[PDB]
Amino acid sequence: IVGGYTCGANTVPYQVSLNSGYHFCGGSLINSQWVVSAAHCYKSGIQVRLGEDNINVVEGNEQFISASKSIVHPSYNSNTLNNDIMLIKLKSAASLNSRVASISLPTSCASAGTQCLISGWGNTKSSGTSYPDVLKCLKAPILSDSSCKSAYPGQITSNMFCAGYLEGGKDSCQGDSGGPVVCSGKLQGIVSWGSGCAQKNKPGVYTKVCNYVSWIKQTIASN
């Protein structure tokens, strides 16, 4: 997250870290045994880390649980990045409390202008590299489909939305993929792709979760 602020220990209880020997993507806990992330974060040997703040030191609130299954959307397109969503089943259920909790799926899609909270342990520099120890947060508004399509001609599908600032300076970056975009307490997006980080006129692009609620609920129930 470029241009954000330190969230504060366990203030984003649904945020998870996907670890394969190191943090490589984020994810959101939707219920005690399932996590939602991006399809491009698919990897073998994933260990899910819950209750994390400082990802480099054991602070005592963590729960490390291996993934038993990783289900990438059947129509995910690695070229166009359409349907960039994946569900990860935990080998065992997490113990939910105030430091670890699930986030609600949306009842409907959010509109342009809605303010949302984006979080992650990704790069904090637009020009350079600086990975944080603690979780970073960013408040950004959802942008209109029209402006999103103007920023990325012929690349935006009905399953994607832009969020951020056209001036640049505040955005998601490498290491934030799969993380949550929460608006009004509901999970509306998944950090997906963009053009560099925090560049002017190039807001981040996110997977539009409201279009997959039916698929998520049914998939979780039959696995």
Partner: protein, 56 residues
């Protein structure tokens, strides 16, 4: 020769560590891959990298 191409992170925001052949140093080095749209100078291990590009 794809072995001489600079490493390509891509548009996606993951932080996946991969290898690429660095012809200037004459060895395979690590770089951050974003998770999508990989070019060919992108390997999962140093061994794969050396086997494919070693001495290019």
């Amino acid at each position: 020769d794809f072995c001489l191409e600079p490493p390509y992170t891509g548009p996606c925001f993951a932080r996946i560590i991969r290898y690429f052949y660095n012809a200037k140093a004459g060895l395979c080095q690590t770089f951050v891959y974003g998770g999508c749209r990989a070019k060919r100078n992108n390997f999962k291990s140093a061994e794969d990298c050396l086997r494919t590009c070693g001495g290019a």
